[PDB]
């Protein structure tokens, strides 16, 4: 189990840690989060009490270093930093644990939610989508745009998701125009899986990361990416059977975790109705279709 120490909490803020969240009052004696499960990526995220505008946060993996949070009063945000002095950090964390100034990562033992949402998500791939190579953790916020959004404007601050565009020469083989547009298997299996992602794990990991950025930060371009990657699979007639079964589990847990009140903005009616009721895979997503029909029958 690992720990993320806070120098202090000078401004009132709602702090999220993965799917959990808690309020910290201005200058409350809060010194961080303990008992964070090793083995998973995590995200620690922030929404200031005074400006709900810009949710922002940091993807990290405690196996990759010792990280902490210090508020910066000039830039006006909680910043993640890395402590290279391991003896400093152990000494600083042990003091705050002894004074019980930390919240405990509150995982129920039965509960596989976070594993199920991050199964294929790796820090190394996050760091290629979110380019800031001097840090081991990755900052994301509500406003960051994607490479593809910028094509249709600061490149350093972009989400470099894999560009998917169903009406593009990458997606459509000359002479197979109608075939490739109505059945995207070529684009999924040859262009994206074999060519770009290399395997379905990396594909699922980017899909999961896009979903999480959409849910935790309201990142609109991430939501676009999540839906595009779903639609690319559902609109393919030929998909490995293990991919479909895993997709069904992935989406099931995403829909399960989505706040009931955010469904109106985080879920694209057209994509979901096409994927569940019209697409080649309309009958291959049983768990997802059942939870969607019982939790969001309005969308459908």
């Amino acid at each position: 189990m690992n720990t993320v120490p806070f120098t202090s909490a000078p401004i009132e803020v709602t702090i999220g840690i993965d799917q959990y969240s808690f309020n910290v009052k201005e200058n409350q004696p809060f010194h961080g989060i303990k008992d964070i499960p090793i083995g998973h990526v995590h995200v620690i995220h922030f929404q200031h009490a005074d400006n709900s505008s810009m949710r922002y946060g940091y993807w990290f993996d405690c196996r990759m270093g010792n990280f902490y949070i210090q508020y910066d009063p000039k830039d006006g945000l909680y910043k993640m930093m890395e402590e290279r002095d391991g003896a400093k950090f152990e000494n600083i964390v042990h003091n705050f644990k002894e004074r019980q100034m930390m919240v405990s990562y509150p995982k129920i033992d039965e509960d596989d939610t976070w594993y199920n949402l991050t199964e294929f998500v790796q820090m190394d791939k996050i760091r290629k989508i979110v380019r800031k190579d001097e840090n081991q953790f990755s900052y994301v916020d509500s406003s960051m745009t994607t490479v593809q959004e910028n094509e249709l404007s600061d490149p350093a601050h972009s989400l470099n998701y894999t560009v998917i565009n169903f009406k593009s020469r990458e997606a459509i083989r000359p002479g197979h125009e109608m075939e490739d547009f109505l059945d995207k298997s070529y684009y999924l299996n040859t262009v994206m899986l074999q060519g770009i992602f290399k395997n379905s794990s990396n594909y699922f990991g980017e899909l999961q990361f896009a979903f999480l950025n959409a849910m935790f930060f309201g990142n609109y371009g991430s939501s676009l990416q999540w839906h595009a990657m779903i639609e690319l699979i559902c609109s393919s007639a030929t998909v490995p059977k293990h991919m479909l079964d895993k997709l069904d589990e992935i989406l099931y847990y995403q829909i399960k975790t989505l706040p009931e009140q955010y469904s109106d903005i985080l879920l694209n009616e057209r994509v979901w109705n096409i994927c569940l009721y019209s697409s080649f895979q309309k009958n291959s997503l049983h768990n997802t279709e059942k939870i969607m029909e019982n939790k969001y029958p309005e969308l459908l």
Binding site: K167, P174, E177
Partner: protein
């Protein structure tokens, strides 16, 4: 974006553009089988690709053999149209290629856009106009060449005959759409109007009769009357 009454004069500026109508691409007769089921028999069709400024009509005849062994023909017909339009553009010298293609039915947008990915600078546009190009097969010489075709074939026409010698392309297009709207609303009556007088003939190299300017005014008035009538006969007014 979409073409409508507001931006109607754009059709007659000097940016090359084509209308594409796919209505007559996939044509069938519906009939009973011996067993008393229903079946279709395809007949020859055509893509109607028209330069509204010049009158040049690129009539790509669609021979029934292209449907042999195919499924979902109404969907294929859209993609076949887009394939043939894209092949037409590629066949034209660069300075003759259109800068816009306007499709008369929205279901042609995605097939044409995908076939024209190689031409990112050609705008593929819908229209809100209700253009009567489906009635092209009421023009006897166009119907004749479509029905006689034994193989795929492109035939070039000028749908305005020699009208542009005497009138503008706005006026020629308005005449054409009035003639075609009439032929679509009541073909027999429209054709009676156009041919009632045997002294006015159709030149071998033309589609429509050789009306004088005054006779066109009479003809045009008769077509409006026909369209208004049928609109009464239809709604009882």
């Amino acid at each position: 974006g979409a073409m409508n009454s507001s931006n109607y004069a754009e059709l007659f500026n000097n940016d090359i553009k084509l209308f594409v109508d796919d209505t007559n691409v996939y044509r069938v007769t519906v009939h009973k089988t011996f067993e008393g089921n229903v079946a279709t028999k395809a007949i020859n069709g055509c893509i109607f690709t028209l330069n509204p400024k010049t009158g040049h009509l690129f009539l790509k005849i669609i021979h029934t053999s292209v449907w042999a062994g195919q499924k979902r023909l109404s969907q294929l017909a859209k993609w076949k149209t887009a394939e043939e339009v894209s092949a037409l553009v590629r066949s034209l010298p660069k300075e003759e290629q259109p800068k816009q293609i306007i499709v008369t039915r929205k279901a042609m947008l995605d097939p044409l856009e995908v076939h024209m990915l190689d031409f990112p600078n050609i705008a593929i546009r819908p229209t809100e106009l209700r253009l009567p190009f489906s009635a092209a097969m009421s023009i006897d010489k166009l119907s004749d060449v479509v029905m006689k075709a034994t193989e795929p074939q492109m035939v070039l026409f000028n749908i305005y005959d020699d009208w542009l010698d005497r009138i503008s392309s706005y006026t020629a297009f308005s005449r054409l759409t009035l003639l075609l709207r009439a032929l679509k609303t009541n073909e027999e009556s429209a054709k009676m109007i156009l041919l009632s007088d045997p002294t006015i003939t159709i030149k071998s190299y033309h589609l429509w009769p050789s009306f004088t300017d005054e006779q066109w005014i009479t003809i045009e008035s008769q077509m409006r009357d026909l369209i208004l009538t049928e609109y009464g006969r239809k709604y009882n007014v």
